[PDB]
């Protein structure tokens, strides 16, 4: 019901997908791609899908 | 007790859902607003500007503002309820902390004279009927749309606005030889209650001078606590010490983003079509009925 | 909301392919849609204070993070696994329902 909705800052961010180790890319992967370096604010809102 | 003509399970899910509605993490319908003409150097949506030391609170009514012949021109005149003096020009009104509570039956010239009195005479005007949402604008995005002071004063009561606030933490610092600009970013409309109750982390960067940036926040320790799964089915946190029964997650008002969900595997198959054998009786005259 | 979760497409990694900080987290299997959860930013993020303020939290005894298969209820007669408890990355309002 509650998911994250993170607004990035488009100057200090890096637009490509971050590439960790392959076994860690299926666990840590979509977390470090949502809290990517340059997250301005991180909100907890109602889930949209 | 007709239990609102509902299921036995549907009330059990309703007791969880009422915890979701009164949660402060989603209650982002902000009521209350403050017109004030203080400057803007460090933008953040948490900033609720303090009322200065020598201001007098005056409750708003229609009796105060009225037309009066002042200097060869009919000017709208304020009558300050402590002293009772007449104040026809907004250039020299005393510092009044007016608290508008109704905003109904109010003229457009009276609303013109108050917003003129904020800019010219440094008033602070609280309005407690304005409902609005807030989106924290990132500084590279900029303010997409503004909100006019004509709409903050001359509007029907139940209109839901949309104010845009900017997190000025990640603004680019200017170079040490750039000659300055000219105009200053001013600010007219401020909130009463704290914005960004939905905020979890902020400014995930690393500043080069100090260890952690000014006002950057960390995620709370309850967002990472899985805890165990109880025997009843209530989600518990981790025990804070030895021999401590853990805190159930539906009592406190924090948010936990990792939870133990009891789920069935591929060896259950709830709700398929099971197949039976039916054997009719031998004679219809041989079927016992009573007493059974 | 009368949903009823069935174990979807779940994978099981080797213990020598994950790092030492994910293997202390992982409960022996996990769903392919792992979700997003800030406890997985431990020693994978670029930010120095966020890596500290999560390691300084998760090393306390009052909290402990995991991901995946924790409980197992074998059947009494057929002796197969019936009801498992996976530690998803999902809020406690949906998970209590």
- Print the SS3 string covering A1-49: CEEEEEEECCCCCCCCCCCCCCCCCCCCHHHHCCCCCCEEEEEEEECCC
Q: Is the dihedral of CA B152, B154, B156, B157 positive or negative?
A: positive
Q: Which residue has the tokens 């340059």?
A: A38
State whether residue C1 is helix, strand or coil.
coil
Nearest to C85, CA basis, from C10, C13, C1, C33 = C10
Residues of B in contact with A30 (CB under 8 A): none
Q: Is the dihedral of CA B112, B114, B115, B121 positive or negative?
A: positive
Cβ contacts of B59 within 8 Å, gap of 6 or more: B98, B99, B101
* B204, A35 contact by CB (below 8 A): yes
Cβ contacts of C81 within 8 Å, gap of 6 or more: B265, B267, C72, C73, C74, C75
* B199, B54 contact by CB (below 8 A): no
Structure tokens at B246: 């853990």
Residues of C in contact with A4 (CB under 8 A): 36
Method: cryo-EM
Pairs across A and C, CB distance < 8 A: 60
Structure tokens at B255: 């948010």
Structure tokens at B292: 């059974």
Residue B215 to residues A4, B57, B113, B203, B270, Cα–Cα distance (Å): 20, 32, 38, 9, 51
Q: Which residue has the tokens 């959860």?
A: C37
Give dist(CA B90, CA B274) in Å, integer: 84
Give dist(CA C94, CA B236) in Å, integer: 14
- DSSP H or E segment with residue C95: helix C92-96
Give dist(CA C2, CA B9) in Å, integer: 9
Q: Which of A3, A8, A9, A33 to mutate to test the interface with B (most CBs of B within 10 A)?
A: A9
Q: Which strands sit side by side in the sheet containing C67-74, from one edge to the other?
A: B259-264, C81-88, C67-74, C26-27
| C-beta atoms surrounding B239 within 10 Å | 17
Half-sphere CA count of B122, side-chain side, radius 13 A: 12
Give dist(CA B30, CA C25) in Å, integer: 39
What does this entry list as its resolution, in Å? 3.2
Q: Which of A5, A18, A28 to mutate to test the interface with C (most CBs of C within 10 A)?
A: A28
* B34, B189 contact by CB (below 8 A): yes
* B99, B32 contact by CB (below 8 A): no
B21 touches chain A (CB under 8 A): no
State whether residue C97 is helix, strand or coil.
coil
- Print the SS3 string covering chain B: CCCCCCCHHHHHHHHHHHHHHCCCCCCCCEEEEEEECCCCCCCCCCCCCCCCCCCEEEECCCCCCEEEECCCCEEEEEECCCCCCEECCCCCCCCEEEEECCCCCCCHHHHHHHHHHHHHHCCEEEEEEEEEEEEEECCCCCCCCCCCHHHHHCCCCCCEEEEEEECCCCCCCCCCCCCCCCCCCCCCEEECCCCCCCEEEEEECCCCCCCCCCCCECCCCCCCCCCCECCCCCEECCCCCCCCCCCECCCCCCCCCCEEEEEECCCCCCCCCCCCCCCCCCCHHHCCCCCC
Q: Nearest by CB to B261, from C47, C58, C95: name it.
A: C95
Closest CA in chain C for residue B15: C97
* A29, A20 contact by CB (below 8 A): yes
CB-based contact B238 C54, cutoff 8 Å: no
Q: Nearest by CB to A11, from B167, B172, B255: name it.
A: B172
Closest CA in chain A for residue B168: A40
Looking at residue C40, what DSSP letter applies?
A: G
CB-based contact B200 A10, cutoff 8 Å: no
| C-beta atoms surrounding C34 within 10 Å | 19
Give dist(CA B9, CA C9) in Å, integer: 29
Give dist(CA B165, CA B50) in Å, integer: 18
Could you tell me the end-to-end alpha-carbon distance of chain A, in angstroms, rounded to an integer? 9
- β C30-31/C10-11 pair status: antiparallel
* C59, C40 contact by CB (below 8 A): no
Give dist(CA B92, CA B116) in Å, integer: 11
Structure tokens at C55: 């390691």
* B139, B111 contact by CB (below 8 A): no
CB-based contact A35 C36, cutoff 8 Å: yes
Residues of A in contact with C36 (CB under 8 A): 3-4, 30-31, 34-35
Indicate left, alpha or beta for B287 from its phi (over 0: left) and psi (-120 to 50: alpha): beta
CB-based contact A27 C35, cutoff 8 Å: no
* C32, C11 contact by CB (below 8 A): yes
Backbone phi, psi, residue C40, to 5°: -85, -5
Q: Which strands sit side by side in the sheet containing A39-46, from one edge to the other?
A: A2-8, A39-46, B199-204
* B139, B118 contact by CB (below 8 A): no
């Amino acid at each position: 019901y509650l998911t994250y909705s993170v607004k990035y800052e488009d100057q200090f961010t890096k637009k490509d997908k971050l590439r960790a180790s392959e076994a860690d890319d299926r666990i840590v992967g979509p977390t470090v791609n949502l809290f990517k370096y340059g997250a301005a604010v991180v909100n907890i809102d109602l889930n949209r899908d | 007790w007709s239990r609102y003509f509902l299921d036995e399970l549907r009330l059990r899910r309703l007791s969880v859902g009422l915890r979701l509605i009164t949660n402060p993490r989603i209650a982002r319908r902000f009521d209350g607003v403050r017109i004030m003409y203080l400057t803007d150097d460090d933008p953040d949506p948490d900033f609720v500007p303090d009322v200065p030391e020598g201001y007098v609170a005056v409750q708003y009514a229609h009796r105060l503002f009225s037309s009066s012949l002042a200097n060869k021109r009919n000017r709208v005149t304020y009558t300050h309820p402590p002293t009772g003096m007449a104040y026809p020009s907004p250039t020299g009104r005393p510092h009044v902390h007016m608290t508008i509570n109704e905003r109904a039956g109010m003229s457009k010239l009276v609303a013109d004279n108050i917003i003129a009195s904020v800019i010219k005479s440094n008033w602070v005007v609280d309005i407690h009927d304005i409902e609005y949402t807030a989106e924290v604008m990132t500084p590279s995005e900029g303010y997409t749309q503004h909100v006019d002071a004509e709409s903050i004063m001359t509007a029907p009561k139940g209109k839901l606005f949309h104010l845009q606030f900017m997190d000025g933490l990640l603004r680019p610092e200017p170079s040490a030889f750039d000659p300055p600009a000219s105009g200053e970013d001013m600010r007219l409309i401020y909130p009463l209650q704290p914005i960004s109750v939905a905020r979890s982390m902020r400014a995930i960067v690393n500043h080069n001078e100090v260890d952690r940036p000014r006002g950057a926040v960390a995620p709370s320790s309850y967002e990472m606590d899985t805890g165990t799964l109880s025997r009843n089915g209530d989600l518990l946190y981790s025990p804070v010490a030895n021999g401590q029964v853990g805190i159930p997650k539906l009592e406190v008002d924090h948010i936990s983003f990792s939870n133990v969900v009891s789920m069935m595997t591929a060896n259950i198959r709830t709700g398929d079509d099971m197949a039976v054998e039916r054997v009719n009786p031998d004679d219809v005259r041989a079927i016992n009925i009573r007493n059974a | 909301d009368n949903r009823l979760v069935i174990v979807g497409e779940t994978t099981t990694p080797m213990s020598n392919t994950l790092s030492t900080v994910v293997n202390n987290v992982l409960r022996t299997t996990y769903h392919n849609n792992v979700g997003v959860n800030p406890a997985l930013l431990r020693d994978f993020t670029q930010v120095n204070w966020l890596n500290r303020d999560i390691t300084n939290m998760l090393q306390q005894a009052g909290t402990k993070y995991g991901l995946g298969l924790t409980e197992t209820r074998l059947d009494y007669v057929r002796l197969v696994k019936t009801i498992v408890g996976h530690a998803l990355n999902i809020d406690h309002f949906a998970a209590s329902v």
